[PDB]
Every structure is written in C-alpha cells, then in structure tokens.
Write an enzyme that holds these catalytic residues in place. Structure first.
Site, PDB file in Angstrom:
ATOM      1  N   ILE A  10       0.871  -1.194   0.000  1.00 48.73           N
ATOM      2  CA  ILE A  10       0.000   0.000   0.000  1.00 48.73           C
ATOM      3  C   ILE A  10       0.901   1.236   0.000  1.00 48.73           C
ATOM      4  CG2 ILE A  10      -0.420  -0.299   2.490  1.00 48.73           C
ATOM      5  CD1 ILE A  10      -3.042   1.379   2.050  1.00 48.73           C
ATOM      6  N   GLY A  11       0.572   2.191  -0.872  1.00 54.20           N
ATOM      7  CA  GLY A  11       1.226   3.499  -0.888  1.00 54.20           C
ATOM      8  C   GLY A  11       2.499   3.629  -1.706  1.00 54.20           C
ATOM      9  N   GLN A  12       2.991   4.871  -1.785  1.00 49.15           N
ATOM     10  CA  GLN A  12       4.122   5.246  -2.650  1.00 49.15           C
ATOM     11  C   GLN A  12       5.481   5.240  -1.919  1.00 49.15           C
ATOM     12  N   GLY A  13       5.727   4.223  -1.092  1.00 46.94           N
ATOM     13  CA  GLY A  13       7.071   3.951  -0.559  1.00 46.94           C
ATOM     14  C   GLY A  13       7.601   4.860   0.539  1.00 46.94           C
ATOM     15  N   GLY A  14       6.810   5.850   0.972  1.00 44.73           N
ATOM     16  CA  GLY A  14       7.253   6.848   1.935  1.00 44.73           C
ATOM     17  C   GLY A  14       7.654   6.310   3.298  1.00 44.73           C
TER      18      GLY A  14
ATOM     19  N   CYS B 222       8.706  -0.723   3.855  1.00 45.71           N
ATOM     20  CA  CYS B 222       8.002  -1.912   3.310  1.00 45.71           C
ATOM     21  C   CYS B 222       6.737  -2.150   4.112  1.00 45.71           C
ATOM     22  CB  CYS B 222       8.888  -3.146   3.286  1.00 45.71           C
ATOM     23  SG  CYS B 222      10.545  -2.747   2.670  1.00 45.71           S
ATOM     24  N   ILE B 223       5.595  -1.877   3.500  1.00 49.40           N
ATOM     25  CA  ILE B 223       4.302  -1.937   4.170  1.00 49.40           C
ATOM     26  C   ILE B 223       3.306  -2.632   3.266  1.00 49.40           C
ATOM     27  CG2 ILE B 223       2.431  -0.557   5.133  1.00 49.40           C
ATOM     28  CD1 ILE B 223       4.292   1.345   6.202  1.00 49.40           C
TER      29      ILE B 223
ATOM     30  N   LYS C  21       4.109  -3.578   8.832  1.00 46.88           N
ATOM     31  CA  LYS C  21       5.395  -2.994   8.480  1.00 46.88           C
ATOM     32  C   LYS C  21       6.436  -4.069   8.725  1.00 46.88           C
ATOM     33  CE  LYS C  21       6.331   1.220   9.671  1.00 46.88           C
ATOM     34  NZ  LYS C  21       6.370   2.653  10.165  1.00 46.88           N
TER      35      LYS C  21
ATOM     36  N   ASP D  47       9.732  15.534  14.298  1.00 36.47           N
ATOM     37  CA  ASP D  47       9.569  15.557  12.849  1.00 36.47           C
ATOM     38  C   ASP D  47       8.116  15.686  12.420  1.00 36.47           C
ATOM     39  OD1 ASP D  47      10.585  15.672  10.252  1.00 36.47           O
ATOM     40  OD2 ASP D  47      11.019  13.562  10.131  1.00 36.47           O
TER      41      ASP D  47
HETATM   42  N1  LIG Z   1      -1.210   2.515   8.444  1.00 33.40           N
HETATM   43  C1  LIG Z   1      -0.991   3.077   7.258  1.00 33.40           C
HETATM   44  N2  LIG Z   1      -1.996   3.021   6.369  1.00 33.40           N
HETATM   45  C2  LIG Z   1      -1.805   3.555   5.149  1.00 33.40           C
HETATM   46  C3  LIG Z   1      -0.639   4.176   4.725  1.00 33.40           C
HETATM   47  C4  LIG Z   1      -0.496   4.784   3.371  1.00 33.40           C
HETATM   48  C5  LIG Z   1       0.701   5.387   2.974  1.00 33.40           C
HETATM   49  C6  LIG Z   1       0.809   5.966   1.725  1.00 33.40           C
HETATM   50  F1  LIG Z   1       2.000   6.529   1.350  1.00 33.40           F
HETATM   51  C7  LIG Z   1      -0.255   5.974   0.835  1.00 33.40           C
HETATM   52  O1  LIG Z   1      -0.132   6.534  -0.390  1.00 33.40           O
HETATM   53  C8  LIG Z   1      -1.443   5.381   1.238  1.00 33.40           C
HETATM   54  F2  LIG Z   1      -2.515   5.374   0.391  1.00 33.40           F
HETATM   55  C9  LIG Z   1      -1.575   4.804   2.482  1.00 33.40           C
HETATM   56  C10 LIG Z   1       0.392   4.231   5.658  1.00 33.40           C
HETATM   57  C11 LIG Z   1       0.239   3.665   6.922  1.00 33.40           C
HETATM   58  C12 LIG Z   1       1.335   3.801   7.907  1.00 33.40           C
HETATM   59  C13 LIG Z   1       1.083   4.268   9.193  1.00 33.40           C
HETATM   60  C14 LIG Z   1       2.122   4.472  10.067  1.00 33.40           C
HETATM   61  F3  LIG Z   1       1.849   4.923  11.326  1.00 33.40           F
HETATM   62  C15 LIG Z   1       3.434   4.242   9.693  1.00 33.40           C
HETATM   63  O2  LIG Z   1       4.493   4.413  10.481  1.00 33.40           O
HETATM   64  C16 LIG Z   1       3.668   3.786   8.417  1.00 33.40           C
HETATM   65  F4  LIG Z   1       4.954   3.523   8.051  1.00 33.40           F
HETATM   66  C17 LIG Z   1       2.646   3.580   7.523  1.00 33.40           C
END
Ligand SMILES: Nc1ncc(-c2cc(F)c(O)c(F)c2)cc1-c1cc(F)c(O)c(F)c1
Ligand SMILES: [Cl-]
Ligand SMILES: [Cl-]
Length: 322
Positions: free
Chosen positions: A24-28, A31-32, A52, A158
């Site tokens: 899920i998501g654009q790598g920010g 690895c999730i 994660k 941050d």
């Molecule tokens: N639980 C989450 N659900 C969805 C996204 C998500 C990220 C995107 F970049 C995106 O584009 C998207 F659609 C969804 C990210 C997290 C998440 C939460 C945290 F607290 C973290 O520490 C973490 F690393 C990731």
C-alpha cells in the site's frame, strides 16, 4: 527481496494470527503491506491494518516498535481518551509484532491501524494552502498528541504534513505517524541534559526543525511545539522565509533564531501587511518562553488556538474542513 508470500499467515509474539495482502502506498514509510486477521478470505483493498516489515537489524523499526509497545497499547490510549475527555487521540494503535525469517534473513514486523491519505497530498491538491479553520483544528489535535507522547517520555522531532494521516473511515481524525526517529527525552522521569546525544544522528526535516536541533542538542518538548509553529505558517501561507536556502543549514538556523527574537518581523514577512493571525504570534511567543527541560502548559496553548477559532466565528467542533 520479497519479504512475504502474498496471502501467507503470520503469527505475532502474542500468538495472534494475521494474513498478508498487497503493498500500500508510494514507498514513503518503508516496506508496508495491507493486513487483516487470519480468515479464509484474501486480504482486500479495504483492509483495516497494515504490516510494516524490515530487517531485524533495522534501527528505526526497533525504535518505533518500542515506542508503540510503551506508549500506544490500545487500552492505554483509550484510558487517556476517557480521563482527558477527548473525542479521539491521533496516536496509532499497536496491534502486535513479531519476528519472521525468509531466505536465511531475519525480519521484524509490526501490525498497526491502516490509515487514509497523508495531509501533504491534500495540501498540494489545495494549491499548498489550508484554511485558518483547518490549521487551527489540525493543531489542536496535534497538541493533544504531543501532550500524550511527551507525558509518555517521548518527543517526535519531525512533525509535518507527510507524517500526518487521516483515519481511513473518518476524515476529521488526524494521526501523527513515524516514530522511527522518535526520541525518549525523559527515560524514567530523568530529563536529558542540554547536550548532543551520540546515540542520535537525526536533525529532523530542515525547513521545520527546532533551533535546539540546529544547535546539535537532543530534541525536547519545546522543540516539538516550535516545529508545529513552523508547520502552521507553512500551511497558512504556502511558504517559509528560509525555504530558498534549505541546502545551507547555517542560514536556516540563523533565520529561525532571528525570527524567534523578533516574532513581529516573522508575522510581517509571512503574512500580508497588518493581516497576521494573532493566535499564531501568541503561540510562538508562548513557546519562546519555554526552557529546554520545561514542561509546556498545553492547555494554555490550546486556549490560544481556541481564541483563533472564536475570532473567525467558529468553535472547536472537530471539523478539519479538508
Ligand atoms: N497505516 C498506514 N496506512 C496507510 C498508509 C499509506 C501510505 C501511503 F504513502 C499511501 O499513499 C497510502 F494510500 C496509504 C500508511 C500507513 C502507515 C502508518 C504508520 F503509522 C506508519 O508508520 C507507516 F509507516 C505507515
Ligand atoms: Cl499510561
Ligand atoms: Cl504560492
């Protein structure tokens, strides 16, 4: 290197079973993958959790996991929500963790709440502005989060829109994420001394970081509130004064120091002449008065922001207006 077989069932240290879905998501945030409780069904696009996963030697995930285990147990958060009479608290819930071996390598995993969009995407889609209403409502909830994590011995260091995520099912609830470089400023009630910490490398995000961080000292509570200050200005105006020189940290620091010494000049710089939101200046003046080890009066800061809502003919109704 793929960390999971899609659809596999993983068991955490509490013997709770989970199933792994697609990324899920654009790598920010590393690895999730989407995740859910173990069942016969596949993990869908509307999964309520994410997993994660990082190598077991990854320092940030260990740091983050310890934060979530110490400060974000579901019952611990719920008890605080009840006793402080909050509608919600934007600290993500920790659901479990464990160790996973694949291809002779050891990984750590952590199961958390799944969220919706980050605020940075929404900000950029709104031509890099949030309204005064939105900024005040975001900031009130961030103050609740900061109070809660500071009372549990941690600073974030941050705070920024890309680390603020909306509740997947409720776009009026904002959560602060990413504790991989969070800092335990007061372990067992003993405040870190005004000093560099050799264990910490991170300086924050240069445009938003605190003067303390620029000075090479470990982050503390006043720094988190200062960061939020810079975020509020960025969100309201689309800009910060030092944004054209972010490759020069000495320049950024010098500007922040000068604008802390003369907050009226900051308001003149960032806002159209004579048209500065008074609560922002009052907020910054109050943060300026904090000593490095001093406990903030968080209710006084929230009252300052609530005066802003009153001034625009609104109230704290929890509406983010995104
Ligand atoms: N639980 C989450 N659900 C969805 C996204 C998500 C990220 C995107 F970049 C995106 O584009 C998207 F659609 C969804 C990210 C997290 C998440 C939460 C945290 F607290 C973290 O520490 C973490 F690393 C990731
Ligand atoms: Cl507690
Ligand atoms: Cl602009």
């Amino acid at each position: 290197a793929e960390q999971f077989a899609v659809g596999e069932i993983i068991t955490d240290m509490a013997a709770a079973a989970w199933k792994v879905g697609l990324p899920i998501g654009q790598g920010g945030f590393g690895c999730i993958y989407l995740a859910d409780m173990n069942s016969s069904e596949s993990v869908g696009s509307d999964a309520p959790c994410v997993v994660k996963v990082e190598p077991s030697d990854n320092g940030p995930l260990f740091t983050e996991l310890k934060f979530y285990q110490r400060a974000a147990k579901p019952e611990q958060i719920q008890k605080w929500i009840r006793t402080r009479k909050l509608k919600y608290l934007g600290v993500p819930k920790y659901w479990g963790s464990g160790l996973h071996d694949k291809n002779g390598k050891s990984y750590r995993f952590m199961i958390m709440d799944r969220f919706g969009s980050d605020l940075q995407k929404i900000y950029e889609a709104n031509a890099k502005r949030f309204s005064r209403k939105t900024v005040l409502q975001l900031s009130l909830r961030i103050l609740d989060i900061l109070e809660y994590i500071h009372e549990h011995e941690y600073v974030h260091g941050d705070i920024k829109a890309s680390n603020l995520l909306l509740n997947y099912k409720n776009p009026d609830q904002v959560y602060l994420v990413d504790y991989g470089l969070a800092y335990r400023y007061c372990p067992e009630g003993v405040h870190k001394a005004y000093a560099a910490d050799p264990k910490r490398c991170h300086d924050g995000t240069i445009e938003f970081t605190s003067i303390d961080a620029h000075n090479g000292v470990a982050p503390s509570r006043r720094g988190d509130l200062e960061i939020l200050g810079y975020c509020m200005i960025q969100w309201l105006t689309g800009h910060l004064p030092w944004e054209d020189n972010l490759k020069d940290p000495k320049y950024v620091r010098d500007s922040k120091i000068r604008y802390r010494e003369n907050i009226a000049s900051l308001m003149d710089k960032c806002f159209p002449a004579a048209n500065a939101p008074g609560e922002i200046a009052k907020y910054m003046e109050t943060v300026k008065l904090l000593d490095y080890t001093e406990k903030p009066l968080y209710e006084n800061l929230r009252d300052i922001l609530l005066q802003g809502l009153k001034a625009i003919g609104s109230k704290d109704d929890g509406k983010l207006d995104l």
